[model samples]
Target: FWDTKGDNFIHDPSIIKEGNTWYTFGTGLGTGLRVIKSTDGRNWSAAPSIFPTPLSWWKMYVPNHEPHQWAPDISYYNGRYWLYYSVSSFGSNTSAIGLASTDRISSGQWRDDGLVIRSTSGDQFNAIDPDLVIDKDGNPWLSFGSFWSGIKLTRLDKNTMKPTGSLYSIASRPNNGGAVEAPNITYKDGYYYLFVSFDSCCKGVDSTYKIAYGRSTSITGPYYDKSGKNMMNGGGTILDSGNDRWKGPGHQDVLNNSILVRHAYDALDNGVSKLLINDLYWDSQGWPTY
Candidate 1:
């Protein structure tokens, strides 16, 4: 929620808290996605860089294209760690999400599995900011999108580790209102909560980003926002926003502790931006309030 001493872009933060160690990854203007670890949640220290920032990636995104590594997500699947990242220009649907894996990310030795999903169906939304979830059935699914439409989900190929099944659109406001980008989802109890950044982002001081949520009885659905709205139809509760040291607080991923739960997000306050972590508690009604 507050600024870190280190000056970095720090956008699209995804956090994984394993035991006493907390790890984070984000896209930045400086170089590859920055990795940081913290013993306590408040104080953080930098770890080695994971993705190598390439000159070709920079050059293509700058003069002619938009940036790669928009939103990076890390998860523990099967038995190892899998990191998902994106590459594509703005205003185009010709985007791709790739995965990188390693037994030890600290050594900076990793392997890349390229191009998981690339949509070219004359869609306007760029596919970036990937979030993965394994449904109750133990099937791996990837939810991603921005710009043109809202967000889309697909089942990942078990053997190839890439998307192999039909694509599903869970939310969209393209060519409409509430720019739906950064889709983050979590499942608990018997409901699926889809958290999404519901406004224009990356505008620096002019940003209107805020976290919104919708719930469905099923993982893939007819998710309804606060006003009984379908996610694809643009409906949800305004979870966190400018009031809680969390301006433009969107794209949050949750972590469950035995006694306490928490989530993290990239909060852009006016022109200043940093990563924000907050405790998430649920009510007897099963509604979550942070």
Candidate 2:
């Protein structure tokens, strides 16, 4: 049983292993985004949270932003670590994604890069669920969206680590209020794979969340499924649709192109969200399998 040891209930886990210590940052309404670590990537021990209170600039965009954070993404780039996180209330388009940098995450050392971008009610896409991807050319791109549109890709300025170029609208679900989000992009063998959660989340055991994906040669993409259908029209090959036991598995993080980490609602645990990790194996044609 996870138990989180004491605190750190895992949701939207962003996992990374550094120097044999497996660390994951996650979301919770209880205490905001916190860190949990493991020695062998199976059992986790809770650490102090990153955001005990909202950032200095959080309220500037999302005035009604929750004290508890949503999804927080972490990745190693340049000589340090950069983390991107979302701040908003329940189901509001007025959301913001903020950035932070740290040489050591274990010591709670994070320097805020201010607000990356935000989406007010007039925006086409919700600004949440940020995933940092360094393409083969080493350029940084951030993918995010929820509810309003589908997924969006924006190039990040190397100096400021914020958006510089025009934003590109990526995968989406038509006529479904774009019930797709939590985009995680991984590059392998000349293709950029976009993984997203289909259907609703945060409903606990009854949640309809499932994992689906597509691949494209271009980072800002017209991604295609195995049948070659463009993801722009709701085309994505199914990855995982949780069974009765583990319900609504989603919000995944694929690390090093080999390991995937996510959260699933546990049926026997009163619908408590639990951290799940699996070995990610790719097919001969480059499709991933859990």
The candidate that wins on TM-score is 2
* Superposed Cα RMSD, model 1: 3.7
* lDDT by residue (tens digit), candidate 1, 1-290: 33343433356788886668877777644555667777766667777775555434334333333433567887787876788877666655666676888775555677866667665646555668898887777778888888576788788866777887688888877446638887877778888777788776766555677777778888777888657878777776887766544456566666552111112333333566566666677768566676
* Clashing pairs counted in every model: 6, 0
What do the candidate models score in CA lDDT, each in turn?
A: 0.68, 0.86
Error of 1 at 194 (Å): 0.8
Cand. 2 Cα-lDDT: 0.86
Q: How does each model score on TM-score?
A: 0.85, 0.96
Estimate, for each residue in 1-290, the C-alpha lDDT of model 2 and write its tens digit.
23333333588889887789989988854656878888866668887787776676787899998888888999999888999999888888899999888987777778878899999999898899999999889999999988777799999978988998898887889966688989999999999999999898989989988899999999986899999988888888989999778899899889999888888888877888888888898998999897
**Can you tell me which runs of candidate 2 are displaced by over 4 Å?**
1-8
Q: Which candidate comes out best when scored by lDDT?
A: 2
On the 0 to 100 scale, the lDDT of residue 94 in model 2 is: 90
